[PDB]
């Protein structure tokens, strides 16, 4: 989904640890 | 497994998110 439908929402960054792994 | 063992399996491409970032 996109952040244009959900009734209650917040802003935080999903880490996806692989970026660290790649570098 | 190996592709031969399963029945009705269809040739297709599976995409990996990690490879693009690495390159
Ligand atoms: C009620 O809940 C919504 C999320 O569904 C939130 O945006 C809102 O701030 C809340 N308001 C009150 C008055 O509880
Ligand atoms: C699926 O059904 C068709 C019927 O035309 C058949 O040719 C095919 O062998 C079947 N798939 C199998 C057994 O995986
Ligand atoms: C595609 O499927 C056929 C099934 O007859 C197989 O012979 C062929 O090797 C497959 N293609 C691949 C692995 O690229």
UniProtKB/Swiss-Prot annotation, chains A, B:
Superkingdom of source: Viruses
Residues modified by glycosylation: 11
Protein's job: Subunit of the fusion protein that is processed upon entry into the host cell. Mediates fusion of the virion and cellular membranes by functioning as a class I viral fusion protein. Contains a viral fusion peptide that is unmasked after S2 cleavage. This cleavage can occur at the cell membrane by host TMPRSS2 or during endocytosis by host CSTL. In either case, this triggers an extensive and irreversible conformational change that leads to fusion of the viral envelope with the cellular cytoplasmic membrane, releasing viral genomic RNA into the host cell cytoplasm.
Protein name per Swiss-Prot or TrEMBL: Spike protein S2'
Annotated source species: Severe acute respiratory syndrome coronavirus 2
């Amino acid at each position: 989904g996109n952040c244009d439908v959900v009734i209650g929402i917040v802003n935080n960054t999903v880490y996806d640890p692989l970026q660290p792994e790649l570098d």
